[PDB]
Amino acid sequence: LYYTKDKSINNVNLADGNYVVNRGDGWILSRQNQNLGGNISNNGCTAIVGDLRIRETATPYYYPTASFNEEYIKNNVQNVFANFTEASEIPIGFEFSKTAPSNKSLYMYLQYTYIRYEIIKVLQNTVTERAVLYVPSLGYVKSIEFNSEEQIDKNFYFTSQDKCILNEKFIYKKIDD
Amino acid sequence: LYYTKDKSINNVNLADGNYVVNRGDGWILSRQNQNLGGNISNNGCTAIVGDLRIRETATPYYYPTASFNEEYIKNNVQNVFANFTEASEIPIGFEFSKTAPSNKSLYMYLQYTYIRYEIIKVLQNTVTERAVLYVPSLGYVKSIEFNSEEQIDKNFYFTSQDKCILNEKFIYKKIDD
Amino acid sequence: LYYTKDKSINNVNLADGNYVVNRGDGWILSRQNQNLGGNISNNGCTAIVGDLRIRETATPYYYPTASFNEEYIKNNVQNVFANFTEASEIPIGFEFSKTAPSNKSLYMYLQYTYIRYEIIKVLQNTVTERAVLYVPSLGYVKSIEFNSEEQIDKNFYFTSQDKCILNEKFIYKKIDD
Amino acid sequence: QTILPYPNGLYVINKGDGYMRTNDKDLIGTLLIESSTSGSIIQPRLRNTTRPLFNTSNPTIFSQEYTEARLNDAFNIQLFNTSTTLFKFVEEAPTNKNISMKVYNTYEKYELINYQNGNIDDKAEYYLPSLGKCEVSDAPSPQAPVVETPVDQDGFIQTGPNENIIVGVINPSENIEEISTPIPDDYTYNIPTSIQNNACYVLFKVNTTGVYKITTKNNLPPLIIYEAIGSSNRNMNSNNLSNDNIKAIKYITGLNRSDAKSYLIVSLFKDKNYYIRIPQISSSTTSQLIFKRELGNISDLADSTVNILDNLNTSGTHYYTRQSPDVGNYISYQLTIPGDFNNIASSIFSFRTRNNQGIGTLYRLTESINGYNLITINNYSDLLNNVEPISLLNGATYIFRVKVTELNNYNIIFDAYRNS
Amino acid sequence: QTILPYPNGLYVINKGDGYMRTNDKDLIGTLLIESSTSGSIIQPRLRNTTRPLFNTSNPTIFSQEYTEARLNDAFNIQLFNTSTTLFKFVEEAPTNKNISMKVYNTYEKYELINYQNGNIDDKAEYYLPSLGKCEVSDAPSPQAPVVETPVDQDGFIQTGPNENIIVGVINPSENIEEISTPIPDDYTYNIPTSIQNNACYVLFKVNTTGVYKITTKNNLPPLIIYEAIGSSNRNMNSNNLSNDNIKAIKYITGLNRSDAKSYLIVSLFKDKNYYIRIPQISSSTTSQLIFKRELGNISDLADSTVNILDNLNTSGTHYYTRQSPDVGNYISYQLTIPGDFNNIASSIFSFRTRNNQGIGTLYRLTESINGYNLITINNYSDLLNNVEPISLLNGATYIFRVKVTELNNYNIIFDAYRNS
Amino acid sequence: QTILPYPNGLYVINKGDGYMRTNDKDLIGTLLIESSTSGSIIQPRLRNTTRPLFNTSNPTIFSQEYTEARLNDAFNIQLFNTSTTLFKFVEEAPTNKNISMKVYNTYEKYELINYQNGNIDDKAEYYLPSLGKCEVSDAPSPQAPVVETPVDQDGFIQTGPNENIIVGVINPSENIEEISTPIPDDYTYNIPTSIQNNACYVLFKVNTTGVYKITTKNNLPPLIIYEAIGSSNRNMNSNNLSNDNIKAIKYITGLNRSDAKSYLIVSLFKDKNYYIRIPQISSSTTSQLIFKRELGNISDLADSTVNILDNLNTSGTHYYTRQSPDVGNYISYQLTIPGDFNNIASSIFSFRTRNNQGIGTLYRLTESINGYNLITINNYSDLLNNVEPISLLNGATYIFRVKVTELNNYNIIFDAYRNS
């Protein structure tokens, strides 16, 4: 139930053509923040949440476009960057832990993180077309201390727009150079 | 090879009829103390014991009676309190750990804990009939420091009478109100 | 690409005949040091390596001889000492951990350890014949701090001759007394 | 009994984490941890099966499967009765005291409502299995007096932090039209015949970021506009709207009341996708959606419905009942004063609200050739049941903007009083 | 060569944890842990299979399966060759020294004995796989001198804490009768014909907590009484004994010696279940078990067999050999002094024991109408081979209680010496 | 472009751990760990499958399977595309700052080369999957400026410690002869006819530890001797060589150059196993391997090839090009001075090297009946292009030992200059 603003700023200092670009790891997606559930502890207890995320839960999200279909995005990304399809066959685990402070309650929730790939079409200044792919990476926990009387900011529980919890990146490769 | 005493004290402040009562978690049963075995460490080592107790090891203990058969006990308990049959299908793990002190030996043993349910018949003062059900809960470790020359009290290794390692409870529901 | 020297010293203070001898745990074998791979961490990270070594990875190494064949070695060892064949059916895990120091990089590698058994023939002074058996025991990690500019001694990565990382033992039993 | 300041439709409400049933019905177990010892309880996911709980006021329509489909529309929840997410609690007891470690399963409570005319007609409650709760406390005395207590009422309590997050979803029994080309400054959309049989949504985006006036011809019926939640960033085409099937929608402005003749002034952004809900129109003549970019300070109405007020030739009471905006948001009213335009004022006007409190700003709407312009005439701190009279020029057009400051009722009532 | 102060029957003895075989036959392995490093050895139960070890002096009767059935009767051990119980050891080496971490499998040693006339006729040893042992020590020098040592004797050693817990079990080749109704103050039980073919047990409980005299008619044969271990709390019926199939039995008092004509004085509690073992009686006439509630200080004999002493009309030595109670427990002897009752004392009596030491109390048993009463005549600090003479009234009944203080022999010998 | 001071053959080179591909192609993922929190990334081996990477200059011969067989010969690597070895990283963030935890898969790089005449003819690179890399650093600002950077060159970088370990392996297309009996002080081995068709190895061991002269009859062809790596300790027989199939071989001394007429002086030990490589000899007459134990200070040549220098009756330049020993190792040259033996010196001799620097020692080889003896005549600090002249007796035998001190070229050139 929220949103930001964007008028412009799509300038790209590179020649005409098509590019596959790694936009970085650590992306979290809108409205799915609490899908995996959350965890409550208190009074010096250590809480641990994790996941051994395999092929059947590592769902990629494709956002294709007129000239860039899903297969095209997949192949160009997997040729230059990590082969996520192959990697999905080998289970990897991650977990977070935090100790609830003394005489207080702690709430912790988990969500998946992603690597964002884009496939862009450019005309010597600006992006004319952009396809997007989110590849499942790992995960990320938000935590907060609370009591029953306390109101919590909406933005803690809920992301309305995709963002990166790390620094965004722009690592490019010209395709059909 | 031991026992306590009981002359009376079965007074219950409630009306005539039948009741299902949760007697609390943390019950341990007589003569099975060391059935799972024990663990020995020394000189600053951390010893860990645990169990991922599933359906085929979580054996309930029914002690039925003339008017309260096993199905009757099961249904009334599972209707008001936790459905242990359903819960038994989902593996849960627990473990304990303790660090052996410097230059000494530590012995540690594990046993299952239980929730005790009773189904009682009452006549406006006292219990006329009582059926008992122990539902597998979790587990409990006793530990002691020792040497080869030391005698250990029988009561450390052996419980001759069912007891609760926590506070006993008396949470009741009138059945066929 | 290295080696040591040996002129003599095979004196054994025991009567004529054949013996099975436990030479101790903690043996590591030549040229397989880094077969399992290694692990790199930095800046206060804890690195953990381990293995749940089962029957299909616990490969024994037999070095039989004219009068002591593999079955003969196996039976005499398993009769007096641990039955490794039976034990191989029950998975056992081990792991090591080390915290990389602040502002430095840590390299860690794993290799299997072994119990060394020998079957010897003696003539009232010296060994005339010796068969050797390495039974998979557990494992052992070497670690070192490093940077990209630093040269590391060959002997860190590579063992050219079988040795024991613990004290060697000589525990004997006369066979066909 | 809160008021939900939203139009008719389906809504999914996350009512928070840490829900569990009464009478230890979700109790996994308790560890007694001796001093200098650690204890642990693990949900290792050796089985993936989880047991969601479900209630509904209408089993036929709001079924478990249906409710799940909406949970996916709203929050993109994939897995309802499985999980690979482990949880674990570790507690070390101090050297002086023993500890009780009590762990429970928990659920996240989602509420699907069918909201009609300020009322919840149907309600489903879906309890998504969650990552547990742990209570650590001083170990009780095993000799503690046993108090006979009755089993308490059968239901749920919440043990997690306070949460109430509302996400509207596209009504899946209403169809979606799409304007593929991003709209220019002036666009007219012909509404298809299907509108005769049920309401529909129309998905679109603007070519240039700016303020837009949106209305039907004759300003009837009233419209509703939504943002697609999460549509920003993601796939884009210069000359084409990129549909990414986002069914999660954020209400901006508009209403259902069939007699609310009106238009919408809304700030729209290039990077976002929007939905307009056109209600069913049983008329056999073709209706239109008219978009018009607006330069100038008409932007002051930034996201508001402008209610056109009519037949106030008579004197005294003129009540207009409309769906109230939430606290902080706008509702606006347009008046063209009866009589010909010279410079005489019409029998002075006095503006008050009757249910909800608000701030309120009176504007003079000009027609000078650069688009429209607004001149501020006056502001009022309080609108409810108290207000001062003011004289307005005949044949002049005024707009009265209300900014809601307290939401006591689902509807806000507006009164344009013509005194003398 | 300890003395086991128990009647004939089957016993299961937990002889402690931490047992392992010699010559590292249960060695899992050793970790060398460098300074500032941690090492770990896990038994994760990826397979559930465990390997119990078993010995028997009689493979046909005391088979592994049979021994297991008794282990279950005694301790309720369910699983013998499987486990889901993981164990793990974690060791961090200090910054100065390296550590050797040596881990072994271990077993819990249970001993099943057939105990007959103070002798073990058959013996089975069952080694239940247990949760391991870890030895941490300073890492040895790899240059340490290699000492040639012979493999030591092939067997077991114990590395766990000292333990010796004895639990008797119902002999499953002897049948169990049941008195369903909880017995009143006075009850007579007719012993069925099956007693002609083998000994049996009779399960019962008392209606009211108190002291009870229990005996056969004519006080032969001798009886044995046991408590069912763990029967307290649990299922109950007001007018019915709740049989919960507890085969674990705790010996209270009684003996096997066929000529020990006697009765039992025992404190019995309402909440417990008891067993009386009646030996085989080849007689064709029907025998009885007689229960009799006793008010008054006959309770001083609280749990004892009262041996009735006869034919001491002759003077001097009168030896009676009986199974000794354990240290701290009672054995009693009843004397009716020869001659008619006026107030003359019979050729003074002197009481001594001959194998085991004890305290000893002489009572005068009255017959005054309120039940029986006991008047204390004298106490003796030591009974063994030293004692002072005392004169007792003719035709009077005296009881001599011995409280055992040292157990040197399986049998205690009692001597009622008539001096003059 | 390093120089590899080794004879012709197959070599497997461990070029270190921590290899990974560019452009995060082996990135598992990144955790953002908030202050006072811990984060963990695990490779738990729930599947055993690993993905080795492989390159070859000759797919037909140096295939993946072939390369794997050599990796096993060299290092005894069993598993190439599976693993049960878990790895895990745990990072706790301080209370002040957040941490980025970035984890990658890694590989250990092995290089199989076919080395011929100081050149690599074929090359295979095998990347064994390894136990990962973790980078922890201060968490980046999410508002950090996005710099547009191109994807860098496609290949590998090394992140582990510097490593370069060379292990030669028996060429499996060359056959292995075996002298089963451990050789005495004097032994002559008849080389089988198979030598006509390809080179072979001959496996042997000595009965007594000592220095040995080894040569073909007529000192042609040149020989090469290796140690079997790991053969010490292990199985032994007094009167028999215990073959344990060790294909990993350590080069001691010898060369391939077909005109290098020579013998070998080598220190050999009883506990080790050795290989001599005899090249192909197309001759139809039977060749021999002659072993001869040497007592006395001929041991000074401890592991060296002794090149026999001929036809230096002419004056001036006499160049001899031979494979250079590594820095620190010996190459030797034997001279018998032209003319009959009285005590006149031959037109003074001057010895210099031309490619590689070395120390150098001139010996007088005597023939006095106790074996051979060496008398030191002179030493030279530097041999390369500078040296002083010296007079040597006619008909006398001298040996010149060079100890290499810098390796600039694959071949060392020796010059025996006869000045006047």
E154 lies in a domain? no
For chain B, how many residues are written? 177
Which of residues D109, D140, D171 is at a domain's end? D140
Strands of E229-299, DSSP E = 236-237, 248-254, 262-268, 274-278, 288-294
Q: Count of H helices and E strands in chain A?
A: 3, 10
Q: Under an 8 A CB cutoff, do E17 and B34 touch? A: yes
3-class secondary structure, C65: strand
Residues in A whose CB is inside 8 Å of some CB of F read: 12-14, 22, 25-26, 50, 52, 54, 80-83, 86-87, 89-99, 113, 137-141, 143, 163-173
Q: Are E131 and E50 in contact (CB under 8 A)?
A: no
Q: The tokens of E315 are what?
A: 């003077």
Mutation for testing the A interface, residue in D205, D233, D273 having most A CBs under 10 Å: D233
Distance CA D374, CA D403 (A): 17
Q: Do chains B and D touch (3 or more CB pairs under 8 A)?
A: yes
Which residue reads 């040995």 in tokens? F212
Q: Which chains touch E (3 or more CB pairs under 8 A)?
A: B, C
Residue of A96, A166, A171 lying closest to F151 (CB–CB): A171
Q: Does F83 touch chain C (CB under 8 A)?
A: yes
Nearest CA-CA partner of E274 in E237, E217, E224: E224
Distance CA C137, CA C27 (A): 9
Q: Do chains C and E touch (3 or more CB pairs under 8 A)?
A: yes
Distance CA D353, CA D320 (A): 9
Residues in B whose CB is inside 8 Å of some CB of D read: 12-14, 22, 25-26, 50, 52, 54, 80-83, 86-87, 89-99, 113, 137-141, 143, 163-173
Please tell me the distance in Å from D164's CA to the nearest CA on chain A.
8
All structural domains of chain C, each given as residue ranges with its CATH number in brackets, are 1-177 (2.170.15.20)
Q: Under an 8 A CB cutoff, do F17 and C6 touch? A: no
Q: Under an 8 A CB cutoff, do B96 and D44 touch? A: no
D149 lies in a domain? no
> Do D320 and D403 reside in the same domain of the chain?
yes
Distance CA E160, CA E134 (A): 11
Question: Cα D186–D188–D190 angle (5° rounding)?
Answer: 170
Please tell me the distance in Å from A14's CA to the nearest CA on chain D.
18
Name the closest residue on chain A to residue D239, using Cα atoms: A128
Looking at beta carbons, which residues of chain F come within 8 Å of A9?
A: none
Compute the 3-state secondary structure of chain A and give helix, strand, coil in percent, each to the nearest 5: 10, 45, 45
> Do D12 and D135 reside in the same domain of the chain?
yes
Looking at beta carbons, which residues of chain D come within 8 Å of A32?
A: 75-77
Give the Cβ contact number of residue A151 at 10 Å: 10
Distance CA F390, CA F161 (A): 49
Residue of E23, E42, E102 lying closest to C94 (CB–CB): E42
Please tell me the distance in Å from D321's CA to the nearest CA on chain A.
26
Range of the domain at F404: 311-420
Query: How many inter-chain contacts (B to E, CB under 8 Å) are there?
Result: 185
Q: Are E42 and C54 in contact (CB under 8 A)?
A: no
**C-alpha distances in angstroms, A113 versus A36, A110, A134, D274, F90?**
12, 10, 9, 27, 18
Domain CATH number, residue E246: 2.60.120.1080
Q: Are D420 and D348 in contact (CB under 8 A)?
A: yes
β-bridge pairing A92-99 and F37-43: antiparallel
DSSP designation for F49: B
Nearest CA-CA partner of C31 in C170, C157, C136, C159: C159
Please tell me the distance in Å from E323's CA to the nearest CA on chain C.
45
D86 lies in a domain? yes
E146 lies in a domain? no
Residues 6+ apart with CB under 8 A from E380: E351, E359, E360, E361, E362, E387, E388
> Do D125 and D190 reside in the same domain of the chain?
no
Distance CA B50, CA A30 (A): 40
Question: Cα E88–E90–E95 angle (5° rounding)?
Answer: 170
Looking at beta carbons, which residues of chain B come within 8 Å of E235?
A: 63-65, 130-132
Residues 6+ apart with CB under 8 A from E143: none
Q: Do chains B and E touch (3 or more CB pairs under 8 A)?
A: yes
Distance CA C60, CA C120 (A): 19
Experimental approach was X-ray
Q: Under an 8 A CB cutoff, do D89 and A53 touch? A: no
Total domains in the fold of chain D:
3
Give Cα E238 distance to the centre of its chain: 30
3-class secondary structure, F179: coil
Give the Cβ contact number of residue D208 at 10 Å: 14
Residues 6+ apart with CB under 8 A from A140: A26, A28, A110, A111, A112, A113, A165, F31, F32
Q: Do chains F and E touch (3 or more CB pairs under 8 A)?
A: no
> Do D128 and D191 reside in the same domain of the chain?
no
Domain CATH number, residue F334: 2.60.120.1090
* Backbone region of residue D218 per phi and psi (left: phi > 0; alpha: psi in -120 to 50; beta: other values): left
Name the closest residue on chain B to residue E85, using Cα atoms: B51
Which of residues F140, F171, F201 is at a domain's end? F140
> Do D163 and D306 reside in the same domain of the chain?
yes
Looking at beta carbons, which residues of chain A come within 8 Å of F140?
A: 166-167
Please tell me the distance in Å from A114's CA to the nearest CA on chain D.
14
E228 lies in a domain? yes
Question: Cα E306–E304–E255 angle (5° rounding)?
Answer: 75
Q: Which chains touch C (3 or more CB pairs under 8 A)?
A: E, F
Q: Under an 8 A CB cutoff, do E159 and B40 touch? A: yes
Looking at beta carbons, which residues of chain B come within 8 Å of E108?
A: 34, 37-38
> Do E381 and E321 reside in the same domain of the chain?
yes
D89 lies in a domain? yes
Q: The tokens of D363 are what?
A: 């504007």
Please tell me the distance in Å from D171's CA to the nearest CA on chain A.
17
* Backbone region of residue F311 per phi and psi (left: phi > 0; alpha: psi in -120 to 50; beta: other values): left
> Do F247 and F329 reside in the same domain of the chain?
no
Residue of A36, A47, A66 lying closest to D85 (CB–CB): A36
> Do E275 and E331 reside in the same domain of the chain?
no
> Do E129 and E256 reside in the same domain of the chain?
no
> Do D208 and D292 reside in the same domain of the chain?
yes
Q: Under an 8 A CB cutoff, do A94 and F29 touch? A: yes
Q: Are F211 and F293 in contact (CB under 8 A)?
A: yes
Distance CA D291, CA E186 (A): 104
CA atoms within 13 A on the CB side of F311: 5
Domain CATH number, residue D71: 2.170.15.20
> Do E294 and E317 reside in the same domain of the chain?
no
Q: Under an 8 A CB cutoff, do F23 and A25 touch? A: no
Mutation for testing the E interface, residue in C41, C92, C145 having most E CBs under 10 Å: C92
Q: Under an 8 A CB cutoff, do F25 and A83 touch? A: yes
Please tell me the distance in Å from C84's CA to the nearest CA on chain E.
9
Residues 6+ apart with CB under 8 A from E259: none
> Do E306 and E355 reside in the same domain of the chain?
no
